[PDB]
Amino acid sequence: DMYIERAGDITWEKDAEVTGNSPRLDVALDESGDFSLV
């Protein structure tokens, strides 16, 4: 039995840390909602 607990407002943070790259990927999405690489 699952339950929910509030964790915060949904807001943009002006001085957030910036990270992560920006990959361009060919993918397929199957009937089960799972992504795979092509």
């Binding site: 699952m2 929910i4 964790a7 943009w12 990270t19 990959p23 999405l29 992504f35």
Partner: protein, 153 residues
């Protein structure tokens, strides 16, 4: 029922376990299907019943139809509002990449958080939720990339 980001918890396992995250907006709770498998949810002494969902999109809404309709502009940085298990909410800014599919392009964020972070919202600069984090793929070098998964309003 206040707007905002919520943890999705279960006690059916040892202690209390965070299975995911979701977004309350306009009286509707939004999360990824794989987090709840479409089960009912408790909020305090109240109950949230599923209203819409779709395994292929990997999304589910509770108490009403899917309300989130903002979309990545394809150009600008976004923020993941990561709510990791046992940890405070934190904003992470990134320029999305792109999932290219036979049915068109989807934004994707190259950020790796525990599975229980699934359902955390991705935001544009206006604070609008452009999709949810947690349905993705592992790329050649072993790292994880999440689609920016958005429903239809």
């Amino acid at each position: 029922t206040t707007d905002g980001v919520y943890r999705v918890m279960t006690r059916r396992l040892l202690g209390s376990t965070q299975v995911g995250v979701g977004v309350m907006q306009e009286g509707v709770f939004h999360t990824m299907w794989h987090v709840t498998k479409g089960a009912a949810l408790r909020s305090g002494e109240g109950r949230l019943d599923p209203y819409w969902g779709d395994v292929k999109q990997d999304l589910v809404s509770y108490c009403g139809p899917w309300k989130l309709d903002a979309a990545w502009d394809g150009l600008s940085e976004v923020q993941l509002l990561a709510v990791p298990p046992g940890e405070r909410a934190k904003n992470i800014q990134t320029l999305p990449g792109i999932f290219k599919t036979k049915d068109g392009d989807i934004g994707a964020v190259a950020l790796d958080y525990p599975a229980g972070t699934s359902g955390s919202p991705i935001l544009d600069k206006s604070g609008r939720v452009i999709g949810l984090y947690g349905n993705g793929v592992v790329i050649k070098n072993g790292s994880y990339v999440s689609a920016i998964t958005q429903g239809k309003r």
